[model samples]
Target: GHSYEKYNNWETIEAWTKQVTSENPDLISRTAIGTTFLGNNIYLLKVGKPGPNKPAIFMDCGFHAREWISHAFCQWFVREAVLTYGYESHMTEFLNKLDFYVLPVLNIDGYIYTWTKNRMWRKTRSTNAGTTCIGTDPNRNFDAGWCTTGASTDPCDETYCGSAAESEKETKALADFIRNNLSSIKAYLTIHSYSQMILYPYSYDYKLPENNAELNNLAKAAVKELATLYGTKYTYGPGATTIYPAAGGSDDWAYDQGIKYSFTFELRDKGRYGFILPESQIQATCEETMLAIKYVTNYVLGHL
Candidate 1:
C-alpha cells in the first residue's frame, strides 16, 4: 500500500504508519506526538525490540515543505530497519540495544500545501497575526538564537521565524516531546534536502559546540560511510561555518538541549534538481544514506 520510491502524501503515509506498526508489533510501535495547526496528527514510530532502559536516537524529516525527498528518505529508513532487523547482524544488534524514534514528517500542513497549492511552499500553514502571510519556517521556529540570523522578521519571507521561539504548533510539540525524552535520547538527526551535506551544531551563531572535536570526527567518518555505496560526496562540519548561519534550527536546539550527537542531513544531487529530485534517484539516495545512518547507529550503541 506504501511505496518508498515514490513520495507519499499525508493520507497514504498516515495509513502506512498504521499498517507497518500492526505488521511488526514486536519491533515497531506508532504514537502521535501532537497535531498540526490544521489538526493533522503528527505520527512518530519507535523501532526497536522491547527492552527496558534502551537509549534512543530521535530523527525527523520534512521540516521544509518543498523538500519532498527528505520525507521519502524517512520512510525508506523505517523500511530498511524493519526488513533487516534479524538478517543483518549489525542492524540486529542495533535494534536489540537501541530504539529509534522516527518522525516521518514534521511540517504536515505545509507538505499538504505543497501537494495541493504552491509546490515551493517552505513553511507551516498557520495564519500570522495582523498579516495575511500564512506560515512560519518550522526549521527557524526553534528556541535556539531564534530569529537572529539567516531568518526573516517579515512573516511573508520563506525563512520567517515564528512570532517567537517554538511558536508554531509543530515546533512546540516536537520541542516538548524531545525535552520530555531527554534522558533516553542520545542523538538527534533531522533530514533536509539538496545540499548533500552532513551538518552539526552551533548553527545559530559563530560559536562551535562544546564537543566540536568529537562532532567533527563523527560527521567526517559518517560522510565517508555514506560515500562507500555510490561515491556520493558530502562535506561535513558545524553548520555555521560549513553553511551559512541559521537561527532556531532544530538541530542546534537539539544539541543545546544536551543531546550530544546531533546532525542535520541535507540530502542528494547537490542542486541539479534541488527540491524536485526525481523519483528515479530515490532508491540510490536512500540506499547510500542508510549506510551513514547505520554507521552512526553502530557508533552510538557502542558508546553506550
Candidate 2:
C-alpha cells in the first residue's frame, strides 16, 4: 500500500527497505554492504532466485542527496519486482534468468543531511582532516581517471575527488562489492536526475570505449522505449561528450571493471523543479523510467 503522493524521509525509506525484503523472502533479501560515515546502514536489496554464479545487473539511486526522484525510482523498482513477479510475464522471465542487486540510497549520510540540515547537500558527510569542509563528492571519488580532467583537488569543491580513490567508506564498500562479484555482474546502472539523459561510459575522458558503438546503440534503443510513455525526450552518448567530463564516476569505474552494460541515467524534467521534484510526478516518472530499465535489462539478457 505504498503511495507516491509524497516523498519519504531517511528513516521511512530505510525501514521500508527492510520491511519489503522481509515481506517477500522468496523474491528479495536485504544485505548491508557498508555503513555511512555517520554510521548509517547502506542496504542492498538482492532481488531474484538464489543461485551460484547467476548473471546479474547492479542498479543504485540517491547518489546525490538532492536528487529525491532518484531514490523514488529505486523504491518503485523493488515494488515492481515483488508485485509483478508472477503477474507480469516479462518480469517473471527476467527474474528467472538474472538477479538484481539494488542499492536504494548509496549516500545515506548525505541523504540524511539533506532532510535535516541542508536540502541542497550533494556530498558524503565525511569530514576531511585539517579542513573545515564537511564532505566529499562520492561520485567523484572513484578511481576511473580520478582527479585528472573534470575532478577537483580541493576538498571544499563540489566535485572534489577526495584525498585518494575510494577514500569514502561508501565508495570503498561498493567498489569492493563489485570487484568481488565481477564474475557474476554483467551490467551496472546508476540513477541521477534533472537532465533527462541516457549516458554510458568514458565520463572521465574524451576517449570512447572499445565497444562504443554497441553501448551507443543500446542507449538509443533504451531511450526510445523510455519515450513511449510520456513523450519525454532523452539524449544518449558517451558521458564525457553527452553531458560533461566527470571523472571517478561509478558508471565509468564499473565499465572499467568489465561490466559492459554500465550506464548512468540523468532522469526527468530537464530543470523545471531541478532537485525538488513534486510528489505528484513520482508515479509518472517511475512508470516511464520502468520502460527504459526493462529495455536495458532485455538488452543485457540478450547479450548474456
Candidate 3:
C-alpha cells in the first residue's frame, strides 16, 4: 500500500506512519502531537535509536497541501533512513548521533481537500472568523512577523497570515512542539515547492542572521550537493532576497527561536509543471533532494 515515489493520501500516510513505527520500533517512534481541525490526529514520527541528551534536527513537509512532492519527500526521507540505517554510512551515523523529528504531513485537512475535492488547495481546512472564507496559510500563520510585508490581511488571499500568530490549530501545534523542545532542536528544515531555492531567515524582513556567512556557505554547499545527481540548479540566499518578504514563515520563526540552522526548501521543476509535478519524477527528485538533506545534516553534526 505504500510506495516511496508515489504521493500517499492522508489516510494512507496515517496508516503508514503507524505501520513503519511498529515495524521498526528501535529506529522509529510515532506520536500524535496534535489534532487537526477536522479531528484527524496529526502524527509526528521520531527517527533514531533511543539515546540520552541527543540533539535533534526537525524537518517537516507538506506545509502547503498542493505541494504533493513535499509530502512525498518526507515519506521518502524516512524510508530512506529506515532502509539504509546500517548499510549506508551517512544515515547510520546520523541516526546514531542525532534524532530526526519528521512531520510527514502538516496540513492534513487541506491535504484531504486536495485528494477529495480540489487538486490545488493549499491551507488548513478550518473556517475563519467574521467571514465565510476558510483556511489560513499555515506557513504564514507563525508568530515571527505575523501579518506583515508579503502576507495578506484578507482571509481569501492565498498568503493570509490569519487573525494572529499561530492562529491556525495546525500551526499552533507545530509551534508549541518546537517551543517545548527548543533546547534540543538545533535546526529546522521545512519543505515547499516550485521555486528550486534553498532559503533561510529572516523571511519576515530583510535583516540577516548573525551567522549569515556560515548559513550562506552551508546553503551554497547544499545546492551543490543537490545538483550532483541531475544538475538541478538552485538559487540560495536569505528568504526575503531569495524569494519574498513572507512574514510569519515557519523558517523565520524557528530561526528567531535560536535554531540558527533553519531552512526552507522550495523543490523541483521551476514551474514547468508547478505544483502538479508528475509522479514519474518523484524518485529522481527525492534522490537528488536527499543529497542536500544529508549534506546539511552532516554539517550540523560536525558543528555539534
Candidate 4:
C-alpha cells in the first residue's frame, strides 16, 4: 500500500532512496551522472523490466529547486515499483517493455538552498561570467533557443538564462546524458510545481509540433485519467498558452531531440503557497499524477 502521507525535507527523501535501492538491487541501479555546482550528486535510477529492447520514458523533477512536491512524485513512483514489483502489471508491462529513467531532483543546490536560505530560490548556484548574482536558472539554461523569448538576460532576474546555453554543469550533465540515451527515450516528462497543467512542445515559440494533434489527444486523455482520482482537474495545452511562454524548457529540448511526447507538468495548487506547498497535499499530488503518467506511458507502449 502507498503511504499517501506527508513528510517533507531532504533527510527523509535521501533515506527513502537509499532503502529502496538497497532492497531492490536486482531491479534497480543507482547511477551518479555528475556532481552539482554545490558538489551534490546528480543521481538517476534506471528502472526496467528485465529487457534490453524496451522503449524509454525520461522523467526529471525539482528543476525549479523549491518545488519539493515534485521530488515526492518521483519517490512515490519508485516506492510503488519497489513494493508492488513495479506495480507488476500495467506499469510492469510498460517497464518490462520500457525503461523509466527517473531523476528525482535536478537542481539540488538550489533545492538545498531553499531548505536553508531562501525558500523560493529558482536557479542553480553557479556563478556566471562576471555576474554578482551567483545562480543560473537551469530550465532556462538549456540549449533550446536560449536567451530568446521567455528568458531573461539579467543575472539577478528570476528567468535568467545563464551566461550561455548549458553554462551550468548541471545543465550540461543532463544535456549530455540525454544525448547519450536519446536512442531509447521516446518521450520526456519533467515534473515541476504550483499549477495542474499538462503541456507539450514548442515552448520556445508559439508554433506547435507536427504531431501536435496526437500529442494533444494524449495530454487530454492523461489529464482525464488524473481527474478520475480526487476530482483534481488538470488543464492541457501547449506550453505557450497554458502557462507563460517558456523557451529552453526540458520539454522543448526533448522534442528537439526527437522525443515526441515531451511534457512539463506544473503540479498542484496555483502558486498560493508556492514552493512551500503544504505537506497535506503531497499524497494528493502523487496519487493523481500517477494516473496521468501511467496513462501516457501505456499509450506509448501500445503505439510501440
Candidate 5:
C-alpha cells in the first residue's frame, strides 16, 4: 500500500510525517534537528529500536533542488520500513540488527523553490549579507574539499561553494548531526538522481580514499543485487571519473569522518528525461534500489 505518487510539496511530506508519527508512536519519532536557511523544517527520522549504539546507516535525498527522483525513493524507503518491517523477512533482519537515519530533503528551501518559482533551482535560499546573489549550492558548501576543484567561486553559479566551509545552515546542521553520531553510522548513503551510477568517496579529486578496496567491493556487490530485478545496470566507480569532480560533498565528508561504507546513489534512467523522470519508472527504481540497499546492509552487518 506504499504506492503514493512522488509528491513534490513540503505540505505533503509534512502530512506523511504526521501520519507516520501518529500511526507508529513507538517505533518512530520526529525530531527537528535544525531549520533550513529559509526557515523550512529539516526533519530527521531517527528510526529503529534501542539501537543508537548499534551500527547504523544514514541516508538523505533531495540535496539538490531538481532531483525529485531522489526524494521519491527516500519517501518510499521510509514507507517500506514502516509498513513491511516485520512482514518482510529481509527488512526485519536489517532493522533488528541495524538502525537507519533518513533525511528526505536536505535543501528544503531549494526544493520548495523548485515547486514554486524555478523548477531547476539548485542551492539553498540563503542570501549573502550585502551581495545580491540568491543561493549557495548546499552540496558544494561542505567542508571536505571546501571551494577547491569542481566548484565555482562566483556567487551566481549553480555549483557555487559557499563563502566558507559550513556556511549554509542546512549543511552545518547535517554535518553536526553526522559528527555527533559518527561512531554508530557505519554507512553514509546520499541519494541523487538521473545518472544510474553508484559513486564513492574522493569526488573532490581523482584520488580514491584509503579504504577504496572495501568501498569498491561493497559497491560491486550492491550492483550485482540491483541487477537481479530489473536488470537496470549501473556504473560504479570513484566520484571523479564516474560523475564529475565535486568538492565538499557529503559522501566524501562522511567517508572522511570514518564511516568507511560511504556511497552516493544516482538513481533512475540515464538522464533521458533528466530530473523530470517519468512516473512509470518510480516503482522499478524503488524495487531495484531495495536490493542494492539490502546488499549494503548485509555488508555493514558483516563489518560491524
Candidate 6:
C-alpha cells in the first residue's frame, strides 16, 4: 500500500497519508488546514516528535495541477520519514530536532480535474463572479507583488492573479497557517516541475533579498548534494533571473514573512517530459530530491 514506484491520484494519496500517520502515531500526525473549492481536504502531515514551539520546515507540493511529480514527491517524502525513522541515523537526528509540515496536495480541486477532465489543467477550479474563466493560478495569487509582473489580470490566462491577493482558498489557508506559525518555521520549500532549479526569494522582482548571498550559497550546496545520486544537474539563483520573473510566488512570500531559508524546487528532466513525466522516473526523482531536502534541513537545524 505504501509505495513510491508510481504516481497516484488524490484519493490514493489521501488514504496513504491517513494510513502512514496512523501506523507511526508516535512520530507523525495528520491535520487538515482547510478545504478546497471543490470541498476536498487540504492535509498537512506533521512529521517529528511532538513538542512546543519546535522550529519547523513548511514544505508543499501540487501547486499546479499538472505537476504530478510535485505531488508524488510529497508522498515519497512522508513515506521516507516514517520508514527510515529508526534505521537512518541522519533522518533520526533530523526528525528528533526539527518538525516538518508537509502538504501533499495544495490544489486538490485542480488535481482532480486533471485526472477526470483535462490532462493539462494548471489552476484552481474556482470561477470568478463576472469572468467565464474557471481557474486562477494559485502560485500567483499571493500578496508578494500581486499581479505587478509576470502574472495576469485576465482570468482566462494560466497565470491569472485572482480577484485579489489570497483570493483563492488554497493560498489563503496556507498563508494564514504560515503567518500564525512564523516564529517556528525556519525554512519553506515548495516543489514544482519542468526545470531542474533551486530558486530563492524575489521571484516577483529583480531586487535581491537581504540575505541573498547566504541563500544562494545554501542552494548551490543543496544542488550539489542532489546531483550525487543520479548525476542530475541543477541551476540555483533568485527565481526572477534563474528561470523567469514571477509575481506572488509562495517562496518569495514566505521569505518576506521571515522564513529566511525559503526555496522553490523545480524537479526532474528539463522539459523532456514536462508535466507528463512518466511513473518510471518517480523513484529516481524522489531519491535525489531527498538528498537535497536533507541537506537543507540539516543546514536549518544547525543554523537554528
For 1-304, candidate 1 gives per-residue lDDT tens digits of 5799899888999999999999999999999999999999999999999998999999999999999999999999999988988899998998899899999999999999999999899999999999998999898999999999999999999999989999988999999999999999999999999789999998899999889998899899999999999999999998889988999999999999999999999999788899999999999999999999998888898887
Tens-digit per-residue lDDT, 1-304, candidate 5: 2344555487788677767867876667778779987788799886676554568899999898888888888888887888887998888778777888889888888888899999888888998766798888888888887889899998888898988988998999999999998878889999988779899998898798888898898898899889999899899989988889989898898888888888999998886898888878788888899889878888888777
Query: What's the TM-score of every candidate structure?
Result: 0.99, 0.98, 0.99, 0.95, 0.95, 0.98
Q: Which 10 consecutive positions of candidate 1 have the poorest summed lDDT?
A: 1-10
- Misplaced by over 4 Å in model 4 are 1-4, 86-88
lDDT of 3 by residue, 274-296 (tens): 99999999999999999999999
User: Candidate 4 — what's its lDDT?
Assistant: 0.83
Native-to-model Cα distance after best TM-score fit, residue 198 in candidate 1, in Å: 0.3
Whose lDDT is higher: candidate 3's or candidate 5's? 3
Q: For each candidate in the order shown, give its overall lDDT on alpha carbons.
A: 0.93, 0.91, 0.93, 0.83, 0.85, 0.92
Report backbone clashes per prediction. 0, 0, 0, 0, 0, 0
Give the clash total for candidate 2: 0
Candidate 5: C-alpha lDDT: 0.85
Each candidate: RMSD to true structure?
Answer: 0.7, 1.2, 0.7, 2.1, 1.7, 1.0
Off by over 4 Å in 2: 1-5
Across 132-240, the per-residue lDDT of candidate 6 in tens digits comes to 8799999999999989999999999999999999999999999999999898899999999968999999889989999999999999999999999999999999999
Candidate 6 off by > 4 Å: none
| TM-score: model 6 vs. ground truth | 0.98
Give RMSD (Å) of candidate 4 vs. truth. 2.1
Clashing pairs in 1: none
Q: Residue 86 deviation, candidate 3, in Å?
A: 0.8
